[PDB]
Amino acid sequence: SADIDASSAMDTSEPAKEEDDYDVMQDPEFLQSVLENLPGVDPNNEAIRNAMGSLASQATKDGKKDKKEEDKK
Amino acid sequence: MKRAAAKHLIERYYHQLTEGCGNEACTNEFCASCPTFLRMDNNAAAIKALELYKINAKLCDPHP
Numbered sequence: 001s002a003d004i005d006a007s008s009a010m011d012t013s014e015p016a017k018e019e020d021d022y023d024v025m026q027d028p029e030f031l032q033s034v035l036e037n038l039p040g041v042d043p044n045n046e047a048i049r050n051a052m053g054s055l056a057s058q059a060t061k062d063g064k065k066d067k068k069e070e071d072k073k
Numbered sequence: 074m075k076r077a078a079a080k081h082l083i084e085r086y087y088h089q090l091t092e093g094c095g096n097e098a099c100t101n102e103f104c105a106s107c108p109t110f111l112r113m114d115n116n117a118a119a120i121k122a123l124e125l126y127k128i129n130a131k132l133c134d135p136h137p
């Protein structure tokens with residue numbers, strides 16, 4: 001509070017989200033274009049494809065589960 | 074313009090890794106020329122740049 005010096009610089013917050021809601025990871029198309037834009041970087045590169053595969057896996061966990069032969073034995 | 078900002082950050086990180094500060098001595102692990110950093114390919118650097126973006130790693134050069 002400007003009126004009180006003690007209040008100033010104390011218990012003062014300035015939240016600024018809103019736009020922060022937007023997530024780039026939610027736009028793979030944009031990310032792909034970014035990598036392609038970079039020099040020496042191509043979508044046909046194995047490294048680029050591998051990175052997307054790993055990132056995609058981490059982003060979403062597979063829910064697939066065996067329905068039989070659970071016990072390898 | 075948030076999308077553009079994201080690209081700029083990645084581009085800066087990529088160039089920083091492929092360029093660095095130019096100084097032999099660097100206190101930034103994720104910066105070219107840094108003894109702790111090793112030269113990377115165009116594809117390898119791209120991956121590192123992407124990863125750096127996620128962690129929002131700080132750049133060697135000071136912010137505007």
Ligand SMILES: [Zn+2]
Nearest residue numbers: 094099104133
């Ligand atoms: Zn540096």
